[PDB]
């Protein structure tokens, strides 16, 4: 019943410093190392370093010396990593893990997102056919949900009554703002004769936006 419990998601401005914690339970803290690992989209896993609590001993990956600092408090059984001079390259999920003869137990991970953006609701743009094309027997519609902060929107297509047919494309952070998209495919008998709507909720701005899908030009 070894458990490593990390601190919560962080939203940080560039140039700031953040401290992530890792509270160890279920074993003797000074007996194992704590490892720190970085999980960045499009990169895989990158080891930052390790600390042996109570011993004064650390090993850092060279490029993190000067950037990451590990401490460990044997009174509270908590390990900490400080990352300074935060940049866009630091947006990632960070894990702590136990180490000694394998990374045998991992924390749940802490998301750090680096951005100058304020809470910004998304712009929601309809994606519907036009351009004088002839619709087939099925039509694909979409909504582009662009320029929001921070994460998590939900797109619902008319209340949920699809039996999807719906694809949700994971958001990407670019230049400090998120963008995602969502598509649905409907029979041509249903659209544009009947209403198709995308409902986009962004709890962090307490906003919900509904866009009715209409042809973008002659069909």
């Amino acid at each position: 019943r070894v458990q490593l419990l990390e601190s919560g998601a962080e939203l940080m401005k560039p140039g700031a410093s953040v401290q992530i914690s890792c509270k160890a339970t279920g074993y003797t803290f000074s007996f194992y190392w704590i490892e720190w690992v970085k999980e960045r989209p499009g990169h895989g896993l990158e080891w930052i370093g390790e600390i042996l609590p109570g011993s004064g001993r650390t090993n850092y990956r060279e490029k993190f010396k000067g950037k990451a600092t590990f401490t460990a408090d044997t009174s509270s059984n908590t390990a900490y990593m400080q990352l300074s001079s935060l940049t866009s390259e630091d947006s990632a999920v960070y894990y702590c893990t136990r180490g000694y003869s394998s990374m045998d137990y991992w924390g749940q991970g802490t998301s750090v997102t680096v951005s100058a953006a304020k809470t910004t609701p998304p712009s929601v743009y309809p994606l519907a056919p036009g351009c004088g094309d002839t619709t087939g027997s099925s039509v694909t519609l979409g909504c582009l949900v662009k320029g929001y902060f921070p994460e998590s929107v939900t797109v619902t297509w008319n209340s949920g009554s699809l039996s999807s047919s719906v694809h949700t494309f994971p958001a990407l952070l670019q230049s400090g703002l998120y963008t995602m998209s969502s598509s649905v495919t409907v029979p041509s008998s249903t659209w544009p004769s009947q209403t198709v709507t995308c409902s986009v909720a962004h709890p962090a701005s307490s906003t919900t936006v509904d866009k009715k899908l209409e042809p973008s030009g002659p069909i």
Binding site: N59, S102, W106, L127, S216
Partner: protein, 219 residues
């Protein structure tokens, strides 16, 4: 440092099949102390990694008996005797012999199905978006298999690479297909300097790209 070359990148299987995954470090992993710190992990979407095998061949507590590891020198192998649904996800190896510790790039164990060509849908910028001076052109490439796909944008027949955002879904639980969304963002000004906008999808199911296009003048 020690590079961990893991193969294959993608391992399609039918449930019940054997699976084998290879990790080749760029040098020996035998520590001065005699131990070989080569380990295997499984990570499921939105979960932390979990240990499977430690020090080459030792099965971690709670790990199913169908997992085993073996190997020596610069060739190590994780074997799954019969793939079950709980085994799908991303596998990686780690070495803990040489600082900095390093990880393999991952192997996605996924479900094998018949190849499927993408359904490709292109959309010009929303009137709503152009009003704000922005212009995002969207291409959905839906319900294809295998996952490997490449999207190329052309503007008036010329390839364009910067300002492109791509997002992929994980394998569909019902279809076993993949989908992807590609978004080309330009300024409204730039968008108006050109007519023909094209997304081209290169995928196993064609020796030639599936091309979708429109001309701004007619949309």
């Amino acid at each position: 440092e020690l590079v961990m070359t893991q193969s294959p990148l993608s391992l399609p299987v039918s449930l019940g099949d054997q699976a084998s995954i290879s990790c080749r470090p760029s040098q020996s992993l035998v520590h001065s102390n005699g131990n070989t710190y080569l380990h295997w992990y499984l990570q499921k979407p939105g979960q932390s990694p979990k240990l499977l095998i430690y020090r080459v061949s030792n099965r971690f507590s709670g790990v199913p008996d169908r997992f085993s590891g073996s190997g020596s020198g610069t060739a190590f192998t994780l074997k799954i005797s019969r793939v079950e649904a709980e085994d799908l996800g991303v596998y990686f190896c780690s070495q803990g012999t040489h600082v900095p510790y390093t990880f393999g790039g991952g192997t996605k164990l996924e479900l094998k199905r018949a190849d499927a060509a993408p359904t490709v849908s292109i959309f010009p910028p929303s009137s709503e978006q152009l009003t704000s001076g922005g212009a995002s052109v969207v291409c959905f490439l839906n319900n294809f298999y295998p996952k490997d796909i490449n999207v190329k944008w052309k503007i008036d027949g010329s390839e364009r690479q910067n300002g492109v955002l791509n997002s992929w879904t994980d394998q569909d639980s019902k279809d076993s297909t993949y989908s992807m969304s590609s978004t080309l963002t330009l300024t409204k000004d730039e968008y108006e300097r050109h007519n023909s906008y094209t997304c081209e999808a290169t995928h196993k199911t064609s020796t030639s790209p599936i091309v979708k296009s429109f001309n701004r003048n007619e949309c």
